[PDB]
Write a protein that binds this ligand. Sequence first.
Ligand SMILES: COc1ccccc1CC(=O)N1C[C@@H](C(N)=O)CC12CC2
Ligand SMILES: [Zn+2]
Length: 139
Amino acid sequence: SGAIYVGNYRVVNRHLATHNDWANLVWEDSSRDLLVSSTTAQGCDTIARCDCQTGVYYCSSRRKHYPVSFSKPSLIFVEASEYYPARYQSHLMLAVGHSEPGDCGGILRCQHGVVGIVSTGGNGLVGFADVRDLLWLDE
Ligand SMILES: COc1ccccc1CC(=O)N1C[C@@H](C(N)=O)CC12CC2
Ligand SMILES: [Zn+2]
């Protein structure tokens, strides 16, 4: 689990969105595994606007933050899971790092701010849904 709280937005994995998220929906995209809802309170996270390929992510299954090198946002084939059939997921970045299914939502960050959230993984890999291209999160 986990979310980004920037301005009056809450960014979560679409597969983990609650009823309140759907009832306060701003934007969702199944192909990216992302959903954004509106919040009453202002958040403290800032979004990175950069092309960093190194950063640090939070892994809840280890209660630890790890440094990682990650690929550029791309279209990658993701195996079938309890929440989606096998399909191509867009705007996904891959890295070598530990992950388990419930690690989804953990933040990946760089020197500039939040880069994205854990969305996929397995066998010593971890994938992150990028949010750096969503410029509207800043206003
Ligand atoms: C962090 O993901 C994993 C880690 C280890 C093993 C397997 C996974 C992948 C996984 O379980 N996925 C991929 C998600 C997606 N974005 O399609 C949907 C979801 C069920 C939760
Ligand atoms: Zn950066």
